[PDB]
């Protein structure tokens, strides 16, 4: 019995939490009570399967059981058992149409938390899982614990708010980043294949554990790949289980992997896993030989490449990565790709060595492009500040791909602008991996949000031609020349002065949702005049809100401000 096996392994509490998450991210629209009901039913069926390991249908796979259960509250269900599952996965909505969740006053939360604790927690997982269908399940358990600790500690102190609100924000943020990072790992596996994912891990783990040996790193990558293959496919229970087995292993071999795995291995399961996943890069091994020796000077290259190209190319990436934590993971993959393309062409020639001898020479432009890009943007950022930098980015992206919907552009550009504060404060040595790998996560968001309802062949081409070159592809785009300006209309922007009650930030989002709309009418409008038409609008909500009158200006000053623009 598979259901029984996972129950004993994970326990009862984690078991219940994981099924809730799996169900919440399969049917994101259904109510809490429905999932809660289905979860308990399943758990009871799991208990009766523990005793009699051959009861009702304790033989059925996790898929079938979970599948039949959801089909009691829902096309997809009219399918059979392999693919009826694939049907569900295909309908996960990355941008669900769900109500903006808002936190009541601290007093209503502490009561709810104190009265029924298990319920207050199940609701956390449900609200988070249904809005982030690819959220890394095992980590959602880790955050749940931290959430519980925020309430347990703060709901007793003096200023509860001054103790809870800050920690719940640090959580919400760390959570969005975690969700984005995981959405990319799932996109790699699902759109590009496990080989693209393994190349990514080999490179990332080699930077983190330079003292590990290719054979050890290769084992780690293999396991990590299964964990993610499973989590990204909805096999939440075996993902959590297998993720525990990997944490166990890594600690039982700290010495053959990394020294900085200390603190990690001296703590709770959930936290140990989290710690290992974010541990800092180890110190680079003593004296490592030159890469040129075994990869460009040697005469066996083409022979080794023929013998086992995959193993050989993995070795190249591992070697180049372990000694370059100053390079972003995608640049490493890019270099590895250039090496591959060269051996493929050179090894088919007469004198191979002479052909692939100056391969490192082709690496030069590849390394310098990202470095110049990070410098140019941190400079702009530093002098303009976040808000202004995001605006500079909004005009740029809207001109690049005018078809994309205003909400996606505004959302994607605001995140792109956060690279400024997230990375520019580091020393040039750690800026690239920080910047480019972060830009990869955000651009992935644009690719998945756009993939649903495509409207731009330019976004589609950059998103699907190559995972590693996504950032450079978008960077090479300029202004869409074939775009035909939008026709202005009334409802273009509901100037309803209900914005005066909105937070200073949602006011910027609305003030940015307008800048996008304008640039769509005046693609050719210079950044100059645009950098002025904003002030003209800031004046609007300014006077209109402070003015003690009806929504007049929202109608009068609004339809009159249009003539002034
Ligand atoms: C009285 C009880 C009660 C509350 C408090 C409630 C609303 C409510 N609003 C929330 C905000 C939210 N919290 C998140 C996200 C996260 N938050 C995280 O801890 C993590 C790890 C993520 C990442 C996925 C989001 C997206 C929202 C709503 C929109 C936003 O502000 O970002 C949350 C999630 C937990 C939190 O961030 O504090 C709840 C439960 N409804 C209720 O009945």
């Amino acid at each position: 019995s598979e259901v029984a096996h996972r129950f004993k392994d994970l326990g009862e509490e984690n078991f219940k939490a994981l099924v809730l998450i799996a169900f919440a991210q399969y049917l994101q629209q259904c109510p809490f009570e429905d999932h809660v009901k289905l979860v308990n039913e399943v758990t009871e069926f799991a208990k009766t399967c523990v005793a009699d390991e051959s009861a009702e249908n304790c033989d059925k796979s996790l898929h079938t059981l979970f599948g039949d259960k959801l089909c009691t509250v829902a096309d997809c269900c009219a399918k059979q058992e392999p693919e009826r599952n694939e049907c569900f996965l295909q309908h996960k909505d990355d941008n669900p149409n769900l109500p903006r969740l808002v936190r009541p006053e601290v007093d209503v939360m502490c009561t709810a938390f104190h009265d029924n604790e298990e319920t207050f927690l199940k609701k956390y997982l449900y609200e988070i899982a249904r809005r982030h269908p690819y959220f890394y399940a095992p980590e959602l358990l880790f955050f749940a614990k931290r959430y519980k600790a925020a309430f347990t500690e703060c709901c007793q102190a003096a200023d509860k708010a001054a103790c809870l609100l800050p920690k719940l924000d640090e959580l919400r943020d760390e959570g969005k980043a975690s969700s984005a990072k995981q959405r990319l790992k799932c996109a790699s596996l699902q759109k590009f294949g496990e080989r693209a994912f393994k190349a990514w891990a080999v490179a990332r783990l080699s930077q983190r554990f330079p003292k590990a040996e290719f054979a050890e790193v290769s084992k780690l990558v293999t396991d990590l790949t299964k964990v993610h293959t499973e989590c990204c496919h909805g096999d939440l229970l075996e993902c959590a289980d297998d993720r525990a087995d990997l944490a166990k292993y890594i600690c039982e071999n700290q010495d053959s992997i990394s020294s900085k795995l200390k603190e990690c291995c001296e703590k709770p399961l959930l936290e140990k896993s989290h710690c290992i996943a974010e541990v800092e890069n180890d110190e680079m091994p003593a004296d490592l030989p030159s890469l040129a020796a075994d990869f460009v000077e040697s005469k066996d290259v083409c022979k080794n490449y023929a013998e086992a190209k995959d193993v050989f190319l993995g070795m190249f990436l591992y070697e180049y990565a372990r000694r370059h934590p100053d390079y972003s993971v995608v640049l490493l993959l890019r270099l590895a790709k250039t090496y591959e393309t060269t051996l493929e062409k050179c090894c088919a020639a007469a004198d191979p060595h002479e052909c692939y001898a100056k391969v490192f020479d082709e690496f030069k432009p590849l390394v310098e492009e990202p470095q110049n890009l990070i410098k140019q943007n941190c400079e702009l950022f530093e002098q303009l500040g976040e808000y202004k930098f995001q605006n500079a980015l909004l005009v740029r992206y809207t001109k690049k791909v005018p078809q994309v919907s205003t909400p996606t552009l505004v959302e994607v550009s605001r995140n792109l602008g956060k690279v400024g504060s997230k990375c520019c404060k580091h020393p040039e040595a750690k800026r690239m991996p920080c910047a480019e790998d972060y830009l990869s996560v955000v651009l992935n968001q644009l690719c998945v949000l756009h993939e649903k309802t495509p409207v731009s062949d330019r976004v589609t081409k950059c998103c699907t031609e190559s995972l590693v070159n996504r950032r450079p592809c978008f960077s090479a785009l300029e202004v869409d020349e074939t775009y035909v300006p939008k026709e202005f209309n009334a409802e273009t922007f509901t100037f309803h002065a209900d914005i005066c009650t909105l937070s200073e930030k949602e006011r910027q989002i609305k003030k940015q949702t307008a800048l996008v709309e304008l640039v769509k009418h005046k693609p050719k409008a210079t950044k100059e005049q645009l950098k002025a038409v904003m002030d003209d609008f800031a004046a609007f909500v300014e006077k209109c809100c402070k003015a003690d009158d009806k929504e007049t200006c929202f109608a009068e000053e609004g339809k009159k401000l249009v003539a002034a623009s």
Side-chain angles (χ1 to χ4, degrees), residues 1-7 9-28 30-51 53-55 57-79 82 85-99 101-159 161-194 196-261 264-286 288-298 300-353 355-374 377-421 423-424 426-504 506-509 511-521 523-526 528-530 532-545 547-553 555 557-558 561-565:
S1 181
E2 187 53 39
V3 203
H5 170 222
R6 305 299 171 175
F7 188 103
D9 274 301
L10 307 168
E12 170 177 61
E13 195 179 303
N14 280 357
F15 177 99
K16 282 178 61 166
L18 294 164
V19 169
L20 176 55
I21 295 169
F23 285 176
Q25 47 182 55
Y26 260 53
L27 280 183
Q28 304 158 271
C30 278
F32 180 58
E33 298 69 0
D34 293 302
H35 291 122
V36 174
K37 190 174 96 67
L38 299 167
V39 173
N40 293 308
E41 278 180 36
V42 180
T43 312
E44 287 304 302
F45 179 84
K47 290 176 180 176
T48 68
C49 283
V50 178
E53 200 151 301
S54 183
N57 303 257
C58 304
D59 53 298
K60 287 190 180 180
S61 64
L62 299 167
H63 281 326
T64 308
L65 278 149
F66 288 37
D68 306 302
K69 295 288 178 176
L70 296 180
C71 294
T72 69
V73 289
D75 291 303
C76 280
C77 289
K79 310 280 191 179
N85 185 60
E86 311 310 301
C87 190
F88 276 118
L89 290 182
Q90 186 173 306
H91 291 90
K92 285 192 181 182
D93 201 317
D94 291 296
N95 196 62
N97 200 2
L98 294 189
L101 190 70
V102 55
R103 310 173 183 173
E105 52 180 62
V106 179
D107 289 300
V108 183
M109 295 191 278
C110 288
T111 300
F113 167 64
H114 280 332
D115 194 43
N116 198 319
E117 183 151 302
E118 168 185 56
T119 298
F120 188 77
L121 282 163
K122 283 169 178 170
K123 197 138 180 173
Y124 169 79
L125 302 173
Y126 165 80
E127 297 304 335
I128 297 312
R130 68 199 299 242
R131 295 190 178 67
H132 296 280
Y134 296 92
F135 206 100
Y136 193 24
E139 284 286 291
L140 189 51
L141 284 184
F142 171 68
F143 288 102
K145 183 187 296 183
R146 286 205 290 176
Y147 186 68
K148 201 174 71 72
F151 276 92
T152 293
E153 192 190 311
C154 291
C155 288
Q156 299 193 310
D159 217 321
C163 173
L164 187 70
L165 301 170
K167 304 190 181 191
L168 294 187
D169 285 352
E170 179 192 59
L171 277 177
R172 186 161 102 223
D173 281 345
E174 208 179 320
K176 297 185 71 169
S178 173
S179 174
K181 269 193 172 183
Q182 188 57 32
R183 188 73 187 68
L184 174 53
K185 291 189 173 81
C186 290
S188 314
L189 287 169
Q190 291 154 347
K191 306 180 187 182
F192 299 102
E194 74 158 57
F197 183 92
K198 283 181 179 180
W200 178 84
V202 168
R204 185 72 192 90
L205 293 187
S206 294
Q207 293 177 307
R208 190 173 288 173
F209 315 140
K211 299 179 190 66
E213 291 200 81
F214 188 64
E216 208 37 61
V217 176
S218 302
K219 197 284 189 297
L220 291 176
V221 175
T222 285
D223 288 332
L224 188 62
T225 298
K226 186 194 171 189
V227 173
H228 284 292
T229 274
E230 310 183 300
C231 254
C232 292
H233 184 261
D235 311 314
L236 308 204
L237 296 170
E238 39 264 64
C239 165
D241 188 50
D242 282 308
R243 190 214 201 184
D245 292 345
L246 179 63
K248 206 186 71 176
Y249 180 90
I250 284 187
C251 287
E252 284 176 32
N253 291 76
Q254 304 186 52
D255 307 292
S256 301
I257 292 168
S258 179
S259 60
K260 303 192 177 187
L261 282 173
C264 285
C265 299
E266 297 288 54
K267 46 186 60 183
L269 170 63
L270 296 203
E271 200 180 317
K272 178 155 57 195
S273 285
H274 177 84
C275 181
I276 302 175
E278 285 191 289
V279 60
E280 69 172 321
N281 302 323
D282 209 332
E283 265 63 53
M284 213 176 289
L288 286 166
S290 52
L291 268 165
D294 314 276
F295 291 105
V296 297
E297 274 150 24
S298 176
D300 280 39
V301 179
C302 289
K303 167 218 285 192
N304 299 310
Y305 182 59
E307 176 80 39
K309 63 181 289 290
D310 301 303
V311 176
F312 190 62
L313 283 184
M315 267 179 265
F316 178 73
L317 187 50
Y318 155 77
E319 289 303 335
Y320 214 111
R322 70 204 297 228
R323 64 200 73 185
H324 273 291
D326 62 313
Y327 282 18
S328 67
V329 180
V330 290
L331 166 68
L332 285 160
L333 297 170
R334 230 177 271 142
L335 296 188
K337 175 70 176 184
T338 297
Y339 187 61
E340 170 161 34
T341 296
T342 309
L343 292 197
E344 270 300 308
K345 72 163 294 194
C346 281
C347 295
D351 192 41
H353 183 258
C355 175
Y356 67 61
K358 304 180 185 302
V359 65
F360 284 40
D361 253 352
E362 294 308 300
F363 282 6
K364 208 191 170 179
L366 296 179
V367 178
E368 287 173 351
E369 190 276 317
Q371 293 199 301
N372 291 327
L373 173 135
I374 275 65
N377 284 263
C378 281
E379 279 186 306
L380 186 64
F381 168 73
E382 283 173 43
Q383 84 177 69
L384 299 179
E386 178 144 291
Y387 185 61
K388 296 298 192 293
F389 188 60
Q390 294 179 318
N391 289 341
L393 282 174
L394 267 174
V395 179
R396 190 58 251 159
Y397 265 79
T398 307
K399 286 184 178 187
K400 275 153 126 66
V401 284
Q403 297 72 28
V404 177
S405 86
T406 287
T408 302
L409 275 159
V410 165
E411 171 79 327
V412 163
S413 300
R414 301 195 83 230
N415 298 333
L416 286 178
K418 287 180 178 179
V419 191
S421 69
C423 301
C424 298
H426 296 296
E428 184 51 55
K430 302 171 189 171
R431 273 193 197 178
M432 204 200 295
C434 186
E436 250 204 314
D437 286 313
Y438 172 74
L439 294 179
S440 280
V441 179
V442 172
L443 289 178
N444 179 59
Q445 176 182 42
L446 167 55
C447 293
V448 306
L449 293 183
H450 166 275
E451 176 178 42
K452 178 199 292 187
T453 52
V455 286
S456 179
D457 303 310
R458 315 173 105 222
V459 168
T460 294
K461 194 258 304 183
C462 277
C463 287
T464 68
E465 182 182 53
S466 160
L467 190 50
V468 167
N469 287 340
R470 278 183 173 180
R471 200 283 301 166
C473 186
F474 279 107
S475 271
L477 295 182
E478 283 297 311
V479 183
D480 195 336
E481 304 170 330
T482 66
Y483 174 64
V484 58
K486 202 180 187 182
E487 277 294 56
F488 172 58
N489 61 309
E491 308 302 305
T492 187
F493 190 66
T494 302
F495 314 89
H496 277 49
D498 74 295
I499 192 174
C500 311
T501 184
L502 296 172
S503 62
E504 167 59 66
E506 286 201 64
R507 184 179 282 83
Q508 296 184 313
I509 297 193
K511 188 193 297 67
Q512 285 174 324
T513 295
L515 180 57
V516 168
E517 288 299 350
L518 294 183
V519 180
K520 293 188 161 185
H521 291 304
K524 291 271 185 180
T526 61
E528 288 47 290
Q529 45 180 175
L530 277 175
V533 185
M534 288 304 276
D535 307 308
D536 298 293
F537 189 62
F540 186 58
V541 189
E542 179 189 61
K543 68 173 183 184
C544 200
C545 287
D548 194 300
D549 65 298
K550 303 301 178 181
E551 304 304 66
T552 302
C553 38
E557 273 67 297
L561 182 61
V562 175
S565 53

